[PDB]
Design a protein around this ligand. Structure first.
Ligand SMILES: O=[N+]([O-])c1ccc2nn[nH]c2c1
Length: 305
């Protein structure tokens, strides 16, 4: 049927992409590859770029998984996003154990530089720092903050910019979905301050793992995130418990309303492959058919001349 690719449709409304997280296991099973080819314009490695996946012991990198994703994307004319270079998730214990500031700075920089160098020029968007905030808006006391202090964020971004000046560099977080929530306010105010200091934060990515009914609030939260003045904002890791068309269309329209929002990435293709499968939160079902939210996004994005 005509005009059924949400990526094609969102591009026709001036955005860069509709994307999805994936990896080798997905691409070779189900109908994921076919759906991504037809309907999506950007992919991200779901897990294969994590620190656990890529640098399981100090200085010794594992790129088979990430390479597969990058190659598939290139073969299929998809943009690539990748991450997360620096966050508290999927960290090896060898990183967590480090207590010396200069050692951890250099471990972090080596991790950033190695990954970004390998894929230099190939990656549209790097999620450089993730989940750096507490719910109250203070900085999360992860190993980087505890050992390096708050300079770890400027250092990560400056390192990333040097490693691949072509990439758009993002900070990302979750629970940025309500405009009155302290975390949302805080990332904005802090990104403003980092950018005023010349830290090369090109984007804020909102990890939109939503519960039912939360789409509406994104219509206020996304504009708020964009007010930090980054060149770009993005929607990441999108899923919605119950997958209501209302929620999904609200999220999409928040993207459309926000000039600097370049695109939307969903957390996966089909419900059974979600980490939250019982909540059926994705756009395709367990038979790989498009759900009502997919079709509602199509209608919302369709445009006579
Ligand atoms: O938007 N994404 O679905 C997504 C998935 C995994 C990631 N790791 N870093 N950034 C990511 C974005």
């Amino acid at each position: 049927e005509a005009a059924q690719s949400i990526d094609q449709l969102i591009k026709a409304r001036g955005k860069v992409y509709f994307g999805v997280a994936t990896d080798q296991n997905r691409l070779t099973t189900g109908k994921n590859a076919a759906i991504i080819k037809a309907d999506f314009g950007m992919v991200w490695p779901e897990n294969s770029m994590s620190w656990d996946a890529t640098e399981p012991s100090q200085g010794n990198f594992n790129f088979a998984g990430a390479d597969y994703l990058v190659n598939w994307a290139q073969q299929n004319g998809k943009l690539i996003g990748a991450g997360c270079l620096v966050w508290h998730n999927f960290l090896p214990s060898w990183v967590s154990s480090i207590t010396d500031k200069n050692t951890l700075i250099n471990v972090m920089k080596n991790h950033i530089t190695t990954l970004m160098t390998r894929y230099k020029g190939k990656i549209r968007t790097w999620d450089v720092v993730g989940e750096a905030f507490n719910e109250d808006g203070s900085l999360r006391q992860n190993v980087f903050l505890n050992v390096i202090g708050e300079d770890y964020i400027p250092i990560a971004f400056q390192t990333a910019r040097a490693a691949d000046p072509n990439a758009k560099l993002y900070i990302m977080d979750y629970n940025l979905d309500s405009a009155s929530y302290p975390k949302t306010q805080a990332i904005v105010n802090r990104v403003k301050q980092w950018r005023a200091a010349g830290v090369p934060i090109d984007g804020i990515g909102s990890q939109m793992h939503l519960s039912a009914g939360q789409g509406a609030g994104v219509l206020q939260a996304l504009p708020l995130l964009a007010s930090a003045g980054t060149p770009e904002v993005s929607i990441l890791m999108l899923d919605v418990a119950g997958a209501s068309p209302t929620d999904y269309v609200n999220v999409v329209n928040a993207c459309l309303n926000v000039q600097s929002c370049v695109g939307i990435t969903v957390m996966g293709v089909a419900d059974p492959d979600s980490a939250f499968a019982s909540s059926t939160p994705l756009l395709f079902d367990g038979n790989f058919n498009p759900k009502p939210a997919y079709n509602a996004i199509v209608q919302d994005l369709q445009q006579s001349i």
